[PDB]
Design an enzyme around this catalytic site. Structure first.
Site, PDB file in Angstrom:
ATOM      1  N   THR A  41      -3.149   6.142 -22.205  1.00  0.00           N
ATOM      2  CA  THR A  41      -2.981   4.801 -21.690  1.00  0.00           C
ATOM      3  C   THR A  41      -1.526   4.428 -21.925  1.00  0.00           C
ATOM      4  O   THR A  41      -0.846   5.035 -22.759  1.00  0.00           O
ATOM      5  CB  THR A  41      -3.905   3.796 -22.399  1.00  0.00           C
ATOM      6  OG1 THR A  41      -3.724   3.893 -23.816  1.00  0.00           O
ATOM      7  CG2 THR A  41      -5.368   4.080 -22.047  1.00  0.00           C
ATOM      8  N   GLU A  82      -0.426   4.745  -0.753  1.00  0.00           N
ATOM      9  CA  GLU A  82      -1.264   5.931  -0.929  1.00  0.00           C
ATOM     10  C   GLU A  82      -0.421   7.182  -0.770  1.00  0.00           C
ATOM     11  O   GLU A  82       0.451   7.254   0.104  1.00  0.00           O
ATOM     12  CB  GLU A  82      -2.397   5.951   0.091  1.00  0.00           C
ATOM     13  CG  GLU A  82      -3.456   4.898  -0.128  1.00  0.00           C
ATOM     14  CD  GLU A  82      -4.310   4.696   1.100  1.00  0.00           C
ATOM     15  OE1 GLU A  82      -3.741   4.495   2.198  1.00  0.00           O
ATOM     16  OE2 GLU A  82      -5.548   4.745   0.969  1.00  0.00           O
ATOM     17  N   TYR A 105       0.849  -1.196   0.000  1.00  0.00           N
ATOM     18  CA  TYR A 105       0.000   0.000   0.000  1.00  0.00           C
ATOM     19  C   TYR A 105       0.883   1.243   0.000  1.00  0.00           C
ATOM     20  O   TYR A 105       1.747   1.398   0.866  1.00  0.00           O
ATOM     21  CB  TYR A 105      -0.970   0.025   1.192  1.00  0.00           C
ATOM     22  CG  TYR A 105      -2.427  -0.111   0.785  1.00  0.00           C
ATOM     23  CD1 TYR A 105      -3.077   0.919   0.099  1.00  0.00           C
ATOM     24  CD2 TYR A 105      -3.152  -1.268   1.073  1.00  0.00           C
ATOM     25  CE1 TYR A 105      -4.418   0.799  -0.289  1.00  0.00           C
ATOM     26  CE2 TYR A 105      -4.492  -1.398   0.690  1.00  0.00           C
ATOM     27  CZ  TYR A 105      -5.114  -0.363   0.007  1.00  0.00           C
ATOM     28  OH  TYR A 105      -6.430  -0.489  -0.374  1.00  0.00           O
ATOM     29  N   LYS A 137      -1.154   0.939 -25.496  1.00  0.00           N
ATOM     30  CA  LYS A 137      -1.403   0.924 -26.943  1.00  0.00           C
ATOM     31  C   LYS A 137      -0.081   1.009 -27.725  1.00  0.00           C
ATOM     32  O   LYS A 137       0.751   0.106 -27.614  1.00  0.00           O
ATOM     33  CB  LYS A 137      -2.427   1.996 -27.339  1.00  0.00           C
ATOM     34  CG  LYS A 137      -3.793   1.783 -26.664  1.00  0.00           C
ATOM     35  CD  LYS A 137      -4.830   2.804 -27.117  1.00  0.00           C
ATOM     36  CE  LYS A 137      -6.178   2.587 -26.432  1.00  0.00           C
ATOM     37  NZ  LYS A 137      -6.104   2.764 -24.956  1.00  0.00           N
ATOM     38  N   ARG A 157      -1.070  -2.462 -18.923  1.00  0.00           N
ATOM     39  CA  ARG A 157      -2.389  -1.851 -18.942  1.00  0.00           C
ATOM     40  C   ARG A 157      -2.517  -0.837 -17.797  1.00  0.00           C
ATOM     41  O   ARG A 157      -2.383  -1.187 -16.627  1.00  0.00           O
ATOM     42  CB  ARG A 157      -3.461  -2.936 -18.857  1.00  0.00           C
ATOM     43  CG  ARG A 157      -4.838  -2.500 -19.308  1.00  0.00           C
ATOM     44  CD  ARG A 157      -5.702  -3.717 -19.660  1.00  0.00           C
ATOM     45  NE  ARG A 157      -5.244  -4.347 -20.893  1.00  0.00           N
ATOM     46  CZ  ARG A 157      -5.593  -3.951 -22.115  1.00  0.00           C
ATOM     47  NH1 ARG A 157      -6.420  -2.923 -22.280  1.00  0.00           N
ATOM     48  NH2 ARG A 157      -5.115  -4.589 -23.175  1.00  0.00           N
ATOM     49  N   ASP A 204      -6.045  13.679 -25.248  1.00  0.00           N
ATOM     50  CA  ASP A 204      -6.011  12.266 -24.897  1.00  0.00           C
ATOM     51  C   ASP A 204      -5.243  11.522 -25.991  1.00  0.00           C
ATOM     52  O   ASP A 204      -5.807  11.159 -27.024  1.00  0.00           O
ATOM     53  CB  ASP A 204      -7.438  11.731 -24.747  1.00  0.00           C
ATOM     54  CG  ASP A 204      -7.487  10.251 -24.381  1.00  0.00           C
ATOM     55  OD1 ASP A 204      -6.435   9.572 -24.403  1.00  0.00           O
ATOM     56  OD2 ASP A 204      -8.601   9.768 -24.083  1.00  0.00           O
TER      57      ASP A 204
END
Lengths: 405, 405
Positions: free
Chosen positions: B223, B53, B51, B226, B232, B197
Site C-alpha cells: 500500500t 485505461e 480516463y 502506511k 490511499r 506484501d
C-alpha cells in the site's frame, strides 16, 4: 494550489498541462465529465488518512464517528436519487462494483449472459482477458444487424439455451434506451438474477431521462464519474434482501479499507445530482446528443441505430471508407477528443474499428448548447471529408479554438 | 477549503469534525499516517476527470500526454526508492495489488502458503471470507509459541508438504524483521514463486531500516498509505520478466480506469520519500517504537516477541486479564486510538482478542519523540491498570490533551 508547486515542480507542471488541456480541447469521450470544485476539495481532504474497514456503526476500528456520517450521507443521498433499498458506496471503481456483485451470487465457472462486447457491452461483462470472462462462463446477446437495437428475442433465446445464473444488462457504447422490464421478464423465465450496469446512464436515470433499472434489477452497479458527474469510483444498489451479502462481498470479500475522501466526494456529487439544476443539465446533455446526432447526419454521417436516446452516439465510418483509428487520430490533430469504437458487426478488429464513440456530458457541463453541437458536427465533417488537407485541418483547429476560447 | 463549505454544509461539517479529531487524538493505529498538504492537493486535482485505461505511451485513448508524465514520474521514483526493475502504480488498494499478483501466477484452486492470520498475516493472505481464501487454497505457517518469531522450519515444512505455487511473506501485525532470503530459499526448494506484501513496512524499506524484499521476491506488493506516508492506494513491484503479465493483470485483468489524481499523489509521496528528511523521519519511527516498547515493558506490559524491530508492537494483555476489545474501548474513552488484535495462539476470537496493536508512524509524523513515547506508555499504564476508575480516566484524558495541545 499552494503547497504542491513548491514541493513537487515536476508533478505540478504536468497537472497544470492537464488542466490547460481539459480547457483547450473539445472533450467528446462519452465516459468523461468535469467535476465541481466542491467534489475535488472533498477528494483533497484529510479523510484519506482514516482506515475505516467495515461499515457505518459497524466498523472494525474506533474513531469513525465522522467518516460514518460522511458514508451515511453518501448512502442516503444515493437511495434518494435512485429509490434503491440499499446502497454500497465503497467500490473503488466500476470494475470493483461489478466484481463484487459477481462475487456475491456466482461461483467460479457459472454461466453469465451479457451484451456482446463488440455490440456495446463492457470489458467487465465477459472479456476473455478480463477477470469476468476468465472467472465465469460468459455468453452474449446481440443487437439487430439493421436497427442496432438489442434483440430481446436473442436475449431470451441465449438465456433459455445457456441457462445463466445471472443476466447482465447495460453497455459502454449503446445509444438507445434499454428495456429493463424485458430483461427482468427474461430473467424470471429462466430463474436468473438480473444485474444492470448503469455506469454510462446513471446521471440520466437520476434526472428521470432514462428508465430506472432499480425496480427491475436485483443488483444495479454504476460508476460515479460518467453522466453522474462525480468522483472516480463505483457504487452498488440492491434491494434489502441482498444488502448483507453485497456489503460482505465488498468487505471483507474483494476490497480492504475504503477511500473515505472519495466517498465524501461521492456524497457531494449525489447532493449536486439531487438539485433541480442537475435535472436541467441532464436534459441539456440528452438534447445536445440528439442535436449533435442530427447535425452529424446532416453532414452525411451514418450513425449506429440511426441516432440516440441518451448522452452518446456511435458514428459508423464505413460510408466514408475510414477506420475509427484513422478518425480518432486526425480529430486529435485538431483538438477534438473521441475514441475509436467497434460498431455492431464490425469487419475490423477492436484495435482498428469502423466507428467513433461520442458523448455530450463533458461539453454540456462546460455550457455548450445546440449551436455548439451544430459547429462540432460541421468541424467533424470538415476534418473527416478532408483528412489529407492540412489547410482544412488548420481551419478545423481554429474553429475548435473558437469554441473553447 | 472554499467551495465545499457553501455547496455541501453537511459534508463539510463532518470533514471538519474529522480534521479536528485527527489533531486531538493520539493516533496509534499501526496502518495509519498523516499525508502532506502537497499529497492532498494532488488528490484534489482535475486529474480525476481523465480516463487513462492502459499505460504511459500505450493508452487506449488520446489526450494522455500529461497524465502519462505523471504516471511515469510515479513509476520511476518508485523504482529509484526500491531498486525494482518494474513498477505498477495503478492498483486502487493493497487488496487490488495482491489480487492482481494472484491473478497473474495462479489458477482457481491453486495452493498458496501465507502467514497464519492470527499470527500476523493479512485478510488478503487467505481469509476464508476474503477472495484469497475463497479463490485459492491457502495453507499457513506460524510463529514460534515462545519467541513469536516466524518459524522458518515451519515455513519450509508447510511448503514441502503442500507444494504451493506461491509463497506469501509479510504481515499486518508482525513486530520483527522478516527474513526474505530464507523465504526465497524455501520458495526455490519447492519451485514456488515468492510474493512479499510489504504494505506495513514499505517506508522503513525505502529508508534502509528494514531489509529490502525486492532482490529476493518475484513480486512485491504494497500500500502507499502506511509507513510510506502516501495517498490511499496500492502498488506492485517486480522484475522485468513479469512486467507485461503484471500490467495485463491490473488492466484489462482486474481494474478499469486508474485513479490518475491518486497516482499524482503517489508520485508526490515517492518524491518526499526520496528526500533525506524522510530517512530521518523513518529512523524516528523505529526509534519511537523501540522506546514505546521499552516504556510499556517498564509499565509492566508483556509484548508479543518481547519488543519490536519496526514501526509496530503488539501488547499481550493476558497478564492483566484484559481482552483487546476491553483495552481498545477504554483507551478510546481517553483519546488514544488503537486496535484490538489477535496475538499468536490467542485463546480469544478475532472479535475479542487478547491484544492491542500499536504503531508509531502517525505520532512521529506529528513530531512526537522519545519523551512523548514515555508519556504515552505511562498513560496506557494508568488507564489499563485502573479501568474502573473514572478519576484515573479523566487524568489520562487530560494528559492526552496535554500531548496534542
Amino acid at each position: 494550489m499552494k503547497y504542491l508547486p513548491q514541493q513537487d515542480p515536476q508533478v505540478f507542471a504536468a497537472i497544470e498541462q492537464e488542466r490547460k488541456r481539459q480547457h483547450a480541447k473539445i472533450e467528446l469521450i462519452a465516459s468523461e465529465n468535469f467535476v465541481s470544485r466542491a467534489v475535488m476539495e472533498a477528494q483533497g481532504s484529510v479523510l484519506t488518512n482514516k482506515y475505516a474497514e467495515g461499515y457505518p456503526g459497524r466498523r472494525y476500528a474506533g474513531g469513525c464517528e465522522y467518516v460514518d456520517i460522511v458514508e451515511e450521507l453518501a448512502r442516503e443521498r444515493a437511495k434518494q436519487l435512485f429509490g434503491a433499498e440499499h446502497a454500497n458506496v465503497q467500490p473503488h471503481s466500476g470494475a470493483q462494483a461489478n466484481m463484487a456483485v459477481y462475487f456475491t451470487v456466482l461461483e467460479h465457472g457459472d454461466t453469465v449472459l451479457g451484451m456482446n462486447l463488440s455490440h456495446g457491452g463492457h470489458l467487465t461483462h465477459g472479456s476473455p482477458v478480463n477477470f469476468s470472462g476468465v472467472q465465469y462462463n460468459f455468453v452474449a446477446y446481440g443487437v439487430d444487424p439493421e436497427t442496432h437495437v438489442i434483440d430481446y428475442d436473442d436475449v431470451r433465446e441465449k438465456a433459455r439455451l445457456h441457462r445463466p445464473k445471472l443476466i447482465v444488462a447495460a453497455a459502454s457504447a449503446y445509444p438507445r434506451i434499454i428495456d429493463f422490464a424485458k430483461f427482468r421478464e427474461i430473467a424470471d423465465e429462466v430463474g436468473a438474477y438480473l444485474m444492470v450496469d448503469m455506469a454510462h446512464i446513471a446521471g440520466l436515470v437520476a434526472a428521470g431521462l432514462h428508465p430506472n433499472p432499480v425496480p427491475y434489477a436485483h443488483f444495479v452497479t454504476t460508476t460515479t464519474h460518467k453522466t453522474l458527474r462525480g468522483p472516480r469510483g463505483g457504487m452498488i444498489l440492491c434491494q434489502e434482501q441482498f444488502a448483507k451479502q453485497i456489503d460482505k462481498a465488498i468487505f471483507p470479500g474483494i476490497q480492504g479499507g475504503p477511500l473515505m475522501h472519495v466517498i465524501a466526494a461521492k456524497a457531494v456529487a449525489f447532493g449536486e445530482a439531487l438539485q433541480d439544476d442537475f435535472k436541467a443539465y441532464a436534459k441539456r446533455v440528452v438534447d445536445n446528443a440528439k442535436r449533435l446526432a442530427s447535425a452529424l447526419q446532416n453532414e452525411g454521417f451514418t450513425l449506429v441505430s440511426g441516432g440516440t436516446d441518451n448522452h452518446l452516439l456511435l458514428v459508423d465510418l464505413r460510408p466514408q471508407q475510414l477506420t475509427g483509428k484513422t478518425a480518432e487520430k486526425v480529430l486529435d490533430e485538431v483538438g477534438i477528443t473521441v475514441n475509436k469504437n467497434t460498431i455492431p458487426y464490425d469487419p475490423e478488429s477492436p484495435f482498428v474499428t469502423s466507428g467513433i464513440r461520442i458523448g455530450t456530458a463533458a461539453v454540456t457541463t462546460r455550457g455548450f448548447g445546440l449551436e455548439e453541437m451544430d459547429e462540432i458536427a460541421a468541424i467533424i465533417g470538415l476534418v473527416l471529408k478532408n483528412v489529407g488537407s492540412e489547410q482544412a485541418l488548420e481551419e478545423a483547429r481554429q474553429r475548435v479554438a473558437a469554441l473553447t476560447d
